[PDB]
C-alpha cells in the first residue's frame, strides 16, 4: 500500500482520518468500492456516525449494520474505524437525568468496544444559557467519559461555532461579559475522563484562533477535525501549516477530515480525494 508523497517501498502512509458523514450516500450505496477508494487516496482511519440507541446498530438518516459487520468491511479495505460521533436522544441535561445519560453511554460503550474504536465523541451542543447549564452538562460529560474509559475508550466533545459564544452566570447583571462555552466545558471536565475534538474550521467561523485554543489547553485537544470551506487547503481562510505545527507540539492523537456538501455540483468523493491529496503532499503534515 504505497505512500503517495514518497516512492520508497518502506515509507508508511501518513495516518489520516475521515468523518464518513462527509460522503453521505456516495459511500453507503457502494461501500466495498468506496472504502477501497478511500484507502487508495491515503485514508487510514474512519470516524463514523449513525449509532441508534434503541437497536445498537448504525444507519444513515431502512437497513442498519451491526458492529461486527461494520468492522469487517472497513478492516478488509485496509482501514480502521477509530472514532464515532453519537449524541443521546435525551435532550434534557439535568442533574436528575444523569442516570439516564449513564445508561445511554454504558450501552453505547459496550457496542463501540465490539466495533474496536479508540474514541467516542459527542458533536452536539446542549442548551446553554448560563454557566450553571454548562456545569451540569460538564458533569454529565465526566460521567460519560468515566464509563467509556472502563473499556479503554476516550470520550470526547466536538465543537462547532456556538461554543464560542459567551454566557453569564445565573443572576449576573447583563451589560464583553461572560465566559466562552468551550472554556467552561474545558474547566469543568476532568482531563482523565474527557478530551476535545477541536474543530479548527468552526473555531475560525466563531472568530477564534484555533492555535490559541490549542496552546492554552494543550493536553485537552486530543483530536482535530480538519475542515475548510470545501477541499482542505483550497480557500483563503485556515493556516494548516500552523495548525499542524501546533498539533504536533501538543501531541494530538489524530485527526479526521470533514467536508460539507458542495455548492458547485461536484461529488463529495472528489472533495475528499483532493483533500487527501493536499494532506498527503503537505510537508507540515506528518
Amino acid at each position: 500500500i504505497p505512500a503517495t508523497d514518497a516512492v520508497s517501498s518502506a515509507t508508511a502512509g501518513k495516518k489520516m482520518g475521515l468523518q464518513t458523514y462527509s460522503l453521505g450516500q456516495e459511500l453507503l450505496q457502494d461501500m466495498p468500492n468506496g472504502l477501497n477508494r478511500l484507502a487508495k487516496a491515503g485514508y487510514t482511519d474512519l470516524e463514523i456516525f449513525g449509532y441508534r440507541e434503541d437497536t445498537g446498530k448504525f444507519g444513515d438518516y431502512t437497513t442498519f449494520i451491526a458492529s461486527k459487520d461494520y468492522k469487517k468491511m472497513v478492516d478488509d479495505a485496509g482501514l480502521r474505524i477509530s472514532s464515532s460521533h453519537l449524541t443521546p436522544s435525551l435532550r434534557e441535561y439535568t442533574k436528575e437525568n444523569m442516570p439516564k445519560f449513564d445508561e445511554f453511554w454504558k450501552k453505547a460503550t459496550d457496542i463501540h468496544a465490539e466495533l474496536g474504536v479508540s474514541c467516542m465523541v459527542q458533536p452536539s451542543l446542549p442548551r446553554i444559557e448560563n454557566e450553571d447549564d454548562a456545569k451540569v452538562v460538564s458533569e454529565i460529560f465526566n460521567r460519560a467519559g468515566e464509563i467509556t474509559k472502563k473499556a479503554g475508550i476516550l470520550w470526547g466533545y466536538h465543537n462547532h461555532s456556538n461554543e464560542f459564544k459567551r454566557v453569564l452566570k445565573a443572576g449576573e447583571k447583563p451589560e464583553p461579559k461572560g465566559t466562552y462555552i468551550e472554556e467552561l466545558f474545558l474547566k469543568n471536565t476532568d482531563p482523565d475522563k474527557v478530551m476535545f475534538e477541536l474543530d479548527v474550521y468552526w473555531a475560525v467561523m466563531g472568530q477564534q484562533d484555533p492555535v490559541e485554543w490549542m496552546e492554552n489547553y494543550p493536553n485537552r485537544f486530543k483530536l482535530l477535525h480538519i475542515k475548510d470551506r470545501w477541499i482542505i487547503g483550497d480557500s483563503g481562510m485556515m493556516n494548516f501549516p500552523n495548525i499542524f505545527k501546533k498539533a504536533y507540539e501538543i501531541g494530538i492523537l489524530g485527526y479526521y477530515v470533514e467536508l460539507e456538501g458542495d455548492k458547485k455540483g461536484r461529488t463529495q468523493f472528489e472533495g475528499v480525494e483532493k483533500s487527501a491529496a493536499y494532506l498527503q503532499a503537505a510537508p507540515f503534515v506528518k
Side-chain angles (χ1 to χ4, degrees), residues 2-39 41-51 53-94 96-164 166-172 174 176-244 246-262 264-286:
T4 62
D5 66 316
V7 296
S8 162
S9 61
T11 308
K14 295 190 196 180
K15 302 293 168 267
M16 174 177 78
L18 178 68
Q19 164 52 249
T20 61
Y21 189 70
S22 303
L23 289 172
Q25 287 294 322
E26 300 179 27
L27 181 54
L28 297 167
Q29 79 194 358
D30 188 4
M31 221 172 325
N33 292 301
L35 295 166
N36 186 69
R37 210 161 152 189
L38 294 180
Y43 293 100
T44 58
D45 282 73
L46 301 182
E47 180 182 71
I48 63 166
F49 69 95
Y51 174 73
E53 74 199 66
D54 57 328
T55 59
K57 293 192 192 172
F58 299 82
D60 69 46
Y61 313 124
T62 176
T63 70
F64 289 85
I65 194 175
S67 290
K68 180 180 176 274
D69 302 307
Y70 212 155
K71 188 175 182 292
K72 173 74 158 128
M73 206 150 49
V74 174
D75 289 348
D76 283 349
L79 297 171
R80 171 177 179 241
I81 307 168
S82 52
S83 187
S84 173
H85 272 199
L86 65 173
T87 301
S89 180
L90 181 56
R91 294 169 182 251
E92 303 289 329
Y93 288 74
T94 64
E96 289 71 27
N97 282 344
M98 298 198 286
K100 295 180 202 156
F101 285 104
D102 292 352
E103 292 306 315
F104 172 87
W105 288 111
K106 286 173 176 192
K107 174 172 185 59
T109 299
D110 287 343
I111 293 291
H112 282 74
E114 293 176 323
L115 190 61
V117 303
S118 296
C119 308
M120 288 161 65
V121 170
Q122 180 164 329
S124 299
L125 184 58
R127 187 170 295 279
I128 309 291
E129 290 169 333
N130 65 33
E131 279 199 18
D132 289 347
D133 296 342
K135 293 179 156 194
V136 178
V137 168
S138 301
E139 293 177 16
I140 289 165
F141 290 175
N142 279 339
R143 290 163 75 115
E146 179 165 3
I147 283 160
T148 72
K149 176 167 86 213
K150 293 194 190 143
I153 299 168
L154 297 173
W155 192 96
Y157 182 75
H158 173 229
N159 62 285
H160 296 72
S161 301
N162 282 338
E163 292 81 358
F164 303 106
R166 288 182 195 267
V167 297
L168 291 184
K169 291 182 163 59
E172 186 167 6
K177 294 193 81 159
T179 311
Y180 293 122
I181 293 167
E182 189 76 357
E183 175 173 347
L184 292 165
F185 289 165
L186 289 153
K187 305 246 206 183
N188 288 288
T189 54
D190 186 332
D192 296 331
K193 296 173 189 175
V194 171
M195 57 83 178
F196 291 80
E197 179 172 69
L198 180 55
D199 202 296
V200 295
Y201 176 81
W202 291 119
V204 174
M205 297 282 286
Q207 306 186 312
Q208 302 301 309
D209 180 6
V211 169
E212 193 178 1
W213 287 83
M214 296 161 73
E215 181 62 21
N216 287 346
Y217 305 91
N219 59 323
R220 307 308 307 282
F221 291 120
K222 292 189 179 169
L223 300 171
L224 305 176
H225 260 214
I226 294 294
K227 184 177 181 312
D228 204 330
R229 300 296 278 178
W230 200 60
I231 288 159
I232 306 301
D234 195 36
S235 82
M237 314 178 46
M238 315 302 305
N239 194 323
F240 287 114
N242 286 345
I243 289 164
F244 276 98
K246 187 57 67 178
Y248 303 127
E249 288 175 28
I250 72 168
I252 65 158
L253 299 176
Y255 69 89
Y256 302 93
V257 173
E258 186 158 358
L259 282 63
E260 71 185 79
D262 194 38
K264 306 200 184 175
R266 299 169 286 194
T267 65
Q268 295 300 100
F269 258 108
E270 181 184 354
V272 160
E273 286 180 323
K274 283 183 166 145
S275 298
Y278 172 79
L279 291 174
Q280 295 273 118
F284 48 89
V285 177
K286 293 336 173 160

